[PDB]
Amino acid sequence: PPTNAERLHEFHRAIGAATPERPTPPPPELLRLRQTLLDAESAEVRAEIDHLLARQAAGEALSAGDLAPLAHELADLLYVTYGALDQLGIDADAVFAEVHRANLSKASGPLKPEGWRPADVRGVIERLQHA
């Protein structure tokens, strides 16, 4: 099964959207569009969360199915977040792996483990540039 990052590549190729194979500095038009898409889904997640809190305040004992609008919007947020990486030509799974390494690694302590190394995303990008 494809990862969610590979699904974004399939989406962008299917609509003729720019999706370079390697890290590519974007024109300002792409950056402003990605901001618009991120702002839309951030506001829609916030709305669904506010809703759920409003329902709990009225005593509601939510069920699993009540989470479906929120789950939806969280997935929309993933979709526009992966999408920005994909249009930058930046393999999202490679960047994620590095942020995951730094995060799982920091999780040994009680805070930083003695030999801890922060996420080196710049290094991931330079490794992506080559093939």
Ligand X SMILES: O=c1ccn([C@H]2C[C@H](O)[C@@H](COP(=O)(O)NP(=O)(O)OP(=O)(O)O)O2)c(=O)[nH]1
Element spanning 22, H or E? none
> Does position 83 bind ligand X by CB under 6 A?
yes
Shortest distance in whole angstroms from residue 79 CB to ligand X: 4
Quick one: 72 or 117, whose CB is closer to a copy of itself?
72
For Cα atoms 117, 122, 128, give the angle at the middle one, nearest 5 degrees.
120
- 91 exposed, middle or buried (CB, 10 Å; 0-12, 13-18, 19+)? buried
Verify binding: residue 88, ligand X, rule CB under 6 A: no
- 86 interacts with, out of Mn ion, a copy of itself, ligand X, none, CB within 5 to 8 A per kind: none
Q: What are the CB-based long-range contacts (under 8 Å, 24+) for 44-53?
A: 44/73, 44/76, 45/70, 45/73, 45/74, 45/76, 45/77, 47/73, 48/72, 48/73
68 binds, among ligand X, Mn ion, a copy of itself, none (CB under 5 to 8 A by kind): a copy of itself
Residues numbered 23 to 82 that lie near ligand X (CB under 6 A) are 37, 40, 76, 79-80
CA atoms of 131 and 129, how far apart (whole Å): 7
Residue nearest to ligand X (CB): 79
Decide if residue 96 touches ligand X (CB under 6 A).
no
As a whole number of angstroms, the distance between CA 60 and CA 24 comes to 49
Q: Choose among a copy of itself, ligand X, Mn ion, none what residue 6 binds, the Cβ cut-off being 5 to 8 Å by kind.
A: none
Give residues in contact with ligand X (CB under 6 A): 37, 40, 76, 79-80, 83, 99, 103, 112, 118-119
